[PDB]
Amino acid sequence: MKMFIGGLSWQTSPDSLRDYFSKFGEIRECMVMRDPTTKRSRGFGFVTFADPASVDKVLGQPHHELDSKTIDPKVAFPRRAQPK
Amino acid sequence: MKMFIGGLSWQTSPDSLRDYFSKFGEIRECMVMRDPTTKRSRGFGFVTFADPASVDKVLGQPHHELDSKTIDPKVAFPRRAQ
C-alpha cells in the first residue's frame, strides 16, 4: 500500500519527499522520478509507510505542499504479474 | 529503469501487460494499478525489462495498442531516498 504523489517540482528530490512525509510516520520506501509524460519539468513519487495509520494522517490533513507545489497524495495498490 | 504506461484500460490485467511487453524482451517485473488521479476508471503500468535493449524496441515501434487503447510507453528512472 503506497501513496502516489503527482505534480512534484523538478527540485523535489527523494530525500525532500521523504523528509516531508516522515512527519506522518515511519517510511519504508520513498522514490521520485521525472514525469516522462510531459516536457514541463515535473516529477511524481511513491511513498511506502510502515504503518497504514500514517496514510490516514496524510489523507486527513486538508492541505499539502512541497517545493512551491500544492500536492494531493493519493493511495495506490500495485498489482504485480507472476512470471510467465 | 522502468517503462511507464499511462492510460491503460481498466480491464488490463498485470498478466496482459506482461504478455504484451514480453514480445519485446525478457521481463523482470510488471505491475498495474488504478490511476488515482481520475474519478473514472483507467490504469497505469510499470514494466521493468531485463535488458535495456528491449526498451529501444518498444520506443521504436510507431503504434502500440493494449485492450483496445492506444498506449505510449515512456522511460522512467526511479530514484530512492537514503
Numbering used by the authors:
A (entry chain A): 1 to 84
B (entry chain B): 1 to 82
Original paper wording:
RNA-binding proteins (RBPs) play critical roles in cell homeostasis by controlling gene expression post-transcriptionally. MSI2 is the dominant family member in the blood and is expressed in 70% of AML patients. It correlates with a poor clinical prognosis in multiple hematological malignancies.
